[PDB]
Design a protein around this ligand. Sequence first.
Ligand SMILES: CC(C)=CCC/C(C)=C/CSP(=O)(O)OP(=O)(O)O
Ligand SMILES: CC(C)=CCC/C(C)=C/CSP(=O)(O)OP(=O)(O)O
Lengths: 273, 273
Amino acid sequence: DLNNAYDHCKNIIEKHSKTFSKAFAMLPKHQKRAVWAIYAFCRRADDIVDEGENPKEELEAFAVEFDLFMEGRLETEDPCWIALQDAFERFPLDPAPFYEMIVGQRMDLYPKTIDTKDDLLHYCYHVASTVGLMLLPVLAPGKVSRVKTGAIELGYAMQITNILRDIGEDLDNHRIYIPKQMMIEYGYTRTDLHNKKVNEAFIQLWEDLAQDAEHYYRNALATLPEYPVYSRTPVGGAAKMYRAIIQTVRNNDYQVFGYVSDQMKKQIIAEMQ
Amino acid sequence: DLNNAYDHCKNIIEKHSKTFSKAFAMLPKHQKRAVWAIYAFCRRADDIVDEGENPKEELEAFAVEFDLFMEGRLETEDPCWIALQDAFERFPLDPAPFYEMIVGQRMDLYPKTIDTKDDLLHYCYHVASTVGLMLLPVLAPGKVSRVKTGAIELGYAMQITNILRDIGEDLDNHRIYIPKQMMIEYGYTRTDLHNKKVNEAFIQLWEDLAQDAEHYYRNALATLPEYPVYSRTPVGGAAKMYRAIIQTVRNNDYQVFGYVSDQMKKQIIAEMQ
Ligand SMILES: CC(C)=CCC/C(C)=C/CSP(=O)(O)OP(=O)(O)O
Ligand SMILES: CC(C)=CCC/C(C)=C/CSP(=O)(O)OP(=O)(O)O
């Protein structure tokens, strides 16, 4: 039934993102549950692409399930779809960012060809900004249009942050998200990258992106007063638990070729309060 | 002196390309020597990028030496520059493809962002077709304009062939030259590639490119009668020693994630005769 389907999504978010599970555990009941179901959609699609053996076939099957879902023709025992069906019935969730997140995950089926910062922002929009857009009707009922730009920019901030701390892990998987034109601009070579070398050129490039992320975090945090009261600490705390990674990397001399404990998360959420 | 400078380039080509050294050892003396010096220019630039510790600094220094060379202001003991200076003084070598090869090697200082076949041909033009263009005044004196298109296409054929047999070695070095749009077209995923998997999608993609290479080889070989007699077996034999790789790969079930012995080279050159 519905309560058990959502409970399955609660376990998914608690297992895969203590950051978001702690942040949004404070939301009122039905909005909290919707967040769980929306997270589960994003987590399933991302896990298919990043950890599936036949990711393209499995993502096509997931996309077809979402097609059936949107036509009201999905018969399933999947708790994530059962919960999401209620969330869409209960709140004016917009299907567009759900479709666009699948487009983003399609991007990650193939090797990267990120040339410019605009290419990078296009990627971040589809795999991260869309998450913000999916959530907005439940985080800010009736106020979506006012907080929308900040939610897109929070997606940019968080995904740029992920990229900046995942350079080595991504490289090991033959994924490169650093824009080629920025490597040319700063003189950071593919051989430097392959050798996992931190040098002056790397630090200049890394700081360029990190300063853009910091700009986007500031813009997003400035919109917190426009959310309803129960979403302000959840959204601001989630933002600040991601942003914390940047100063840690700096304090680690930019060694990102290999960040926030649960107590540290609790501290960040209380500080935000 | 000049004889020793060229002899140093003879040793370079004999050490790094038994294919080209055997092919062009049949050329008349002064044209043979020019080929050695031209090869040495290409080999030095490629070795800087592919095996140098600080490739960008070393390629900038090489480019500055070529700037001085072209102004007649290079004072050097480098036998490769001494030999090339005579080749430029002796034959109407065109500086343009030498500059363009340096542009191509600059491309390989950074990770690849090859999206389309046209992107791939652009790369092959600058790192391979340019070699053909550098050589044409010594392989076909007075007849450069007639054989030029075939020489560009031979560059495409040879470099596509290199890419098709180097997929694994390039992947290990975080280089991907397969066009992303072709991976999408045939359904060959980044995870497949990372896993070094040969599947139906890979074979379709590989054959698509191999058939383009075979087309370019046929066009190039059709121009052999327009070369002077002493270049026909050298150029045709070099072409056929590279082309041989394609059928071997097919006979090896497309296993290119890890080709022509010296006797096999001698056999191909005699067959071409
Ligand atoms: C609360 C609002 C409006 C936005 C916060 C949530 C958001 C943009 C999540 C996307 S971060 P992302 O990188 O896509 O997801 P993970 O890699 O952390 O799993
Ligand atoms: C004889 C003519 C006109 C063209 C033949 C030479 C040519 C196009 C050589 C370039 S092959 P390329 O891949 O650039 O060089 P290597 O990787 O084999 O060292």
